[PDB]
Every structure is written in structure tokens, then in C-alpha cells.
Design a protein around this ligand. Structure first.
Ligand code: PLP
Ligand code: PLP
Lengths: 410, 410
């Protein structure tokens, strides 16, 4: 009994397993990985250091590690249709750090999505290494439509003359035209990086256009929609850039890779290669649409861009609670975690925001469908209309338990 | 069930457990973690995105995760004698990157140990962000004694006037005087960073003086001598440095921490707080000494600095095989993994080297003792003397096999 040595730690692990079961996870980044993905991270591959790349290791005894990493590498190439993959990045933050390091120089100018319109921290926030190391100039969505305007971007690009354009977002609901982003990049002589961390699973599933054929380099996380272990991944079709990327990940930015997590990457990528992953993607698309329909129909809420063609959507809540932070707290009391979130052309402080961000991938991996998704948005609408009224929140929390009980987690 | 879906990957994982049993691991960086450490990494805490810090998270649903991270922080503060601890770095390299971001500006001068006397890549290699981002100037050991010379280092520091001195090494056998390093830093108005990755276990066990009282900031891997999951850890007693370290790690450098690996850190730190960890420490010291003795007493080999007071030691092999690369290969042939290693004032090319590096932590962790340790060194001498005599190697493999059988890995 290894658990018996450390009850304080393993009682917390049980408490979290319980907490998850009794919690509706609507946070768009979140998912529920298979038992195989978890099992793989908990193997004795943690024991073995593999500084270097397959058949170019610093150390010996690395023959079987090369099989595991080469599987992961080959499975990502096959799934995403890329000539080159690096599976060693510890996180999406590090995968992004390696691409910047490979394509541009400290102080060089970079275009990323506005951080209220769907841009990521790592796409130029001044509190991120990304902001501090490079000159980031944001491109917005159109104010009226809340859509990417490829004409407006192209004209801004022509003035800013960036060395690099970043596309991909964590709060944009609509299909990105990657062909148009590359057309713009080519129009001004810049690289295109696509950070697809949010949509990588929808890309695996067929439901989002691939940026792989259009981006010079594509980064993603292996967690989020792709539903793998916590980590990062870099794809490219350019052999010269693959060489630079490999160098930047190690020994540029990282030391030894987490080969146990890389075994969980290989596993999860094989799961994404299965026809059942197409079904999952389909249900991610429907479940999010079902939830968003409910906010569309209700007069006191506006969905950003009018709806969604991916795993998530934002809602302006400001007609019903003071701000997004309030919205967020209220729903935690009914055992529904989402997150406050900026909306295009945000008026309020970044700590308050005008919006909530809903996502479908977690409830979808639990086995929930459109009925359940609609039900959960009605509950969100009731709880938020009745933020004042604890007797009301208390009834809803009891209904949430009925539904969580109904849909086990593992 | 779930392994049937992916036989290719789970057979490679069976292959690596086999290989690990049938191999004598003397790579000094390596260890054998407990079943609890692997188990904790294989739990559903990978599903919870926890950006931020305990009671200051971006997302709700994070109360239990706050218990698991605070366990790790508190266990690290207790074990190491530190007022502040950050358990979020994905690796030693990321831990180091966060400390540089916290204490110095890009282009500032840093002294670290030479990448040939025991310096790490992250201590100024031109191929690491360390060398690229900062002005690294390396300090050496005395040519004659192979010891750090605290008077020479002070003399160098007065000339180079660094913002930061890095102490700590990956190939140095002797007790470091952390008070002397701080005296030098204080003498020249420099911060002191100690990277104790290789010796964190022997510090935990009480067999190596703590740097914690003397370093402005201590970094380490949670793996290596401390026998934890692969990751990093930062320690300081300065509240204002702790605030900057925390910002640096997130959102400066990382995104979401690996809360499952943090759980495993928490397990490992409680393991190293146990009295049994002191015996592990004692046995690491005796076993490495036993192995060093054999190279000392043999005329054709020289141990660097004449021996060791920690877990590792270097041997000049060049009076027996052409270089350290050949030594590494011969020994792989008989199921002993170690690494070629630059020695002080290395004459040969980095790729070839004069030296081998032996460590006791891994065999110590498999329950081996002084007798076994001496046998392995005898076998290494025999094998190397008789390198191009396949008759002999075959018999040593057979012998090794008998010993690996005798000490099950798990
Ligand atoms: C191993 C090591 C590191 C880096 O750890 P990774 O987890 O490989 O990034 C840094 N410093 C020292 C002294 C080390 O031994
Ligand atoms: C989550 C995310 C990242 C960073 O991933 P971490 O593993 O948390 O470092 C980067 N970019 C995007 C778009 C993301 O969604």
C-alpha cells in the first residue's frame, strides 16, 4: 500500500477525482483524457534521460525510448499531414517559445490577434516573455461583425511590415481562413505561425481547416481539444526550419524531454487517428452550438459573432450581471466552472471583463449530447438572471448533481 | 482493456521496463522513482488547468489542486529550510530560465562553472538561451588539484564584475563551500544562484552542505539524486525575489503547470523527509566511493580530484582506450550505461572526450551495496583493458546479467 505512506496527498487526489465527477466543466481548454493517456504518464519512462533526438541521443540505452518518441513523431505527421514534427516541447508556451526563437530575433516586429479578440498570453502580452522579447502589434476583428477582416489585416500588415504573423486564438468561435493568412504573410514577406492549441482536435477530427499546409510552422498543445497529455507539439513542412526548431527546443530552451508524457502523446495521437475521433469532433461541434443557441434566443444575452463553428463561444453578460467575474463566481456555486473573458473591444478592466467563455469538449468527452448541453445553458441563464437569490442557486446545484450522477466521468 | 487498442506503444513500454531491469545504470543524472511517484503522475490531475498560484488562480474548481500544490510548496520549504518555494517549473532548464529572468537583464554578465569542469548547458553554453541571452564568463577548477579555488574565482569576479554568479555542477565530485561562493558574490555586489540539481538528494539526506542559507536563489531538478518526478523547483528566503520568481515562472515563461507531476513532487519530497532517505544518502556516498577506489588503486586509470565526496566521479580512460566515446560504447556492449565526459582542461574534442562519468544513485536505489559497487568497477576496468576481445565482454555481459537478475528493479 504506497497510498498508506502519504494519506494527506492521496486523500487530495481522491478529493479532486470526486470534485471533477460533481463538476460541469465548461472551460474551453479543458478535456478528459483516456485511462491509457494517464497510465502512460505513470510508467517508468520517467527514470530514463533522453537529451537529444532519436538516433542522436547524448546517452545510450535510448534504443527503446527512440521507438516511443519515433511513434509519437510519426503519428503526429500522419494525423496532421506534416513532413516534420517535434514532440519534446513541455507545454504550448514552450512550443511557441521555440518557434519564435527559430524564425525571428529579439525586438523584431510580430503581428498577433488582439488579446481581447482571442489572442493568447504567448501572442504578445507584456507580462509574457513573448511581449518582453519581441515587438507585438495586434490585429483586431471588425467591430460590427466580430469576424476577422482579411482585407483590414492585409492593409495593417502592409504598414507594420512584421517579420512574423501569428494566427490562432483561445476566444474566437468562427472558422479561420489559413490560406488567407498565408496569402497576407506572402503579401508582406513575413512568416506565418499558427497556434492551433484550442482547435487542434477539431483539426484532427476534420471539423476545422488545417493550417499545416499554409503555416510555415504550426504549434499546438497535446491537451485541450486533441485530448492528450499536458504538453506541446511543433509541425512544419520545411526541412530547414525543422532543423532550427529541433535546435531551439533542445538544447535551446529545454533539457531532457519527459519521455513518459511523450508515450502519452503517442497514445493520444493514435486515439485521434481512430474514426471514433471524427464522432467526438462532430459532438463537440453540436454540443457547443446547442449551448450557444440558448444565449442567442434569450434577449438579455448576445453571443460574440452571433454563434460558433468550433468548440467554444463568448457571451456578453453585462445586461444581467455587473461583469464576467460575477458571472463566473455565480456559476461556481451551481458546480459549473467557466471563465470570465474579454470580448472584442472590451470596455471594462481585464480583471472584470464583459464576457463568459463556454466550451463543449469536456461535457462531450463525458458522453453528453445536445439535450444535456441545452439544459446546462438554461441553468446558466437561470443562475445568472437570479445571482441575488441563494434559494434559486441551491435548486440548480441539486439539478446539476442529478445530471453529473447521470453521466459518470470514468 | 485499453492496452489492446495500442499494442505497438505498450510493447515498447514493456521493452523499456525489460531493458531497465537488464541494465546497470551508472549515468549519474539517473535514478529509480517509487511506485507512488509514477502513480501520482498517472492520475486525472492532468485534466485540471491551474494557471496562477494557490488562492490566486485564473480558474475556479481549483481548491483541491491548491491543497496538492501547497503540500509540495510546504514539503519543499520544510525539507530544504527555505521560506519560499515554487514547484511549477516544467524542468531544471525552465527553473534556471525563471531565476535569470527574475535577477538580471538580457546582456548582463554571469559567471558559471566551465561546461568542461562540471558546468551545465544552462550555465552559458552558446547553444543554450543562457549563452545567447546573457554574457556568460566561465570559471574553472585549479589545473593541478582539480579543486575549485575560491581565491582565483574572487580574482576573476573582480575583473568580470558579474550581476550573477552560478555555482553548482554536473561533473564535480567535491563538497562545494556555499559560504565561500556567497562571500565572493558579496565582495562584488553580485547575486548568487546555486543550481543543486545533481546533489539535491545529498542536500536532502544531509550528506552535502545546503546552499539554501547562502544562495539568493536555489534551483534544482526534482529528479536526479532527490529521486522525484522529472521537473524543476525554485527556493529563496527573500520575499521580493519570491514575488518576481513567481511572475517569471507564470505568466513570464510557462502557461499551465503540470499539477499531476506536482502531485508526484509532493510524494517524492515526503519520501526524502523520511529517515530512510538519510540511509539512501549514506549508501549513495559509500557506493560511489567504492567504485572510485577501484579506479584509484588501478595504475592505468586516474579519478579526477583523486576521488569523490558525492554521488559521482570522472575517470581519465585515455591510457586504455582512445577516448571517452569508445569507453561509453565498450560498456554499453556489456549492459553498463554511463557517459563519456569532458575532464578539466579537456584536450580532445567535446564529441570524444578523455573521460567517463560514473554515478551510484541508480544502483544504490536498486538496493546494491559496496561489494556490488566494487564488482561493477572491476567489470568496467576488465572490459576496457580488453576492449577489442569479444571473448571477454561476452563473459562480463553474462556476469552483469547474473547481478541485474539478483537485484530486481521493481
Ligand atoms: C539536469 C540538469 C539541469 C536541467 O534539467 P532538465 O530537467 O534536463 O532541464 C540543470 N542543471 C543541472 C545542474 C542539471 O544536472
Ligand atoms: C493553452 C494555450 C497555450 C499554452 O499552453 P501551456 O501548456 O499552458 O503552456 C498557448 N497558446 C494557446 C492558443 C493556448 O490555448
Amino acid at each position: 500500500d504506497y497510498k498508506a505512506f502519504d494519506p494527506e496527498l492521496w486523500n487530495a487526489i481522491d478529493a479532486e477525482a470526486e470534485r471533477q465527477q460533481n463538476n460541469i466543466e465548461l472551460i474551453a481548454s479543458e478535456n478528459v483524457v483516456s485511462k491509457a493517456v494517464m497510465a502512460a504518464q505513470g510508467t517508468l519512462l520517467t527514470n530514463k534521460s533522453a537529451e537529444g533526438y532519436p538516433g542522436k541521443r547524448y546517452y545510450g540505452g535510448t534504443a527503446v525510448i527512440d521507438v516511443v518518441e519515433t511513434l509519437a513523431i510519426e503519428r503526429a505527421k500522419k494525423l496532421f499531414g506534416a513532413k516534420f514534427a517535434n514532440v519534446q516541447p513541455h507545454s504550448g508556451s514552450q512550443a511557441n517559445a521555440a518557434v519564435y526563437m527559430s524564425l525571428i530575433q529579439p525586438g523584431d516586429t510580430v503581428m498577433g490577434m488582439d488579446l481581447s479578440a482571442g489572442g493568447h498570453l504567448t501572442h504578445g502580452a507584456p507580462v509574457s516573455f513573448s511581449g518582453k522579447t519581441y515587438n507585438f502589434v495586434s490585429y483586431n476583428v471588425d467591430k460590427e461583425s466580430e469576424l476577422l477582416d482579411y482585407d483590414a489585416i492585409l492593409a495593417q500588415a502592409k504598414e507594420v511590415r512584421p517579420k512574423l504573423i501569428v494566427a490562432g486564438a483561445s476566444a474566437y468561435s468562427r472558422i479561420i481562413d489559413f490560406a488567407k493568412f498565408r496569402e497576407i504573410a506572402d503579401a508582406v514577406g513575413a512568416y506565418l505561425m499558427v497556434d492551433m492549441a484550442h482547435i487542434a482536435g477539431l483539426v484532427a477530427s476534420g471539423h476545422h481547416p488545417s493550417p499545416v499546409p499554409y503555416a510555415h510552422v504550426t504549434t499546438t498543445t497535446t491537451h485541450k481539444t486533441l485530448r492528450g497529455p499536458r504538453g506541446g507539439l511543433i509541425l512544419t513542412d520545411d526541412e530547414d526550419i525543422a532543423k532550427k526548431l529541433n535546435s531551439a527546443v533542445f538544447p535551446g530552451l529545454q533539457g531532457g524531454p519527459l519521455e513518459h508524457v511523450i508515450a502519452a502523446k503517442a497514445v493520444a495521437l493514435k486515439e485521434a487517428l481512430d474514426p471514433a475521433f471524427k464522432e467526438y469532433g462532430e459532438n463537440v461541434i453540436k454540443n457547443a452550438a446547442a449551448m450557444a443557441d440558448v444565449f442567442n434566443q434569450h434577449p438579455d444575452f448576445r453571443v460574440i459573432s452571433g454563434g460558433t463553428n468550433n468548440h467554444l463561444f463568448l457571451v456578453d453578460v453585462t445586461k444581467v450581471v455587473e461583469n464576467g467575474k460575477v458571472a463566473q463566481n455565480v456559476l461556481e456555486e451551481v458546480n459549473i466552472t467557466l471563465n470570465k473573458n474579454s470580448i472584442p473591444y472590451e470596455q471594462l478592466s481585464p480583471f472584470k471583463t464583459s464576457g463568459i467563455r463556454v466550451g463543449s469538449p469536456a461535457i462531450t468527452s463525458r458522453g453528453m449530447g445536445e439535450a444535456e448541453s441545452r439544459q446546462i445553458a438554461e441553468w446558466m441563464v437561470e443562475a445568472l438572471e437570479n445571482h441575488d437569490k441563494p434559494e434559486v442557486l441551491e435548486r440548480i446545484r441539486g439539478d446539476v448533481k442529478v445530471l453529473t450522477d447521470a453521466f459518470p466521468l470514468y
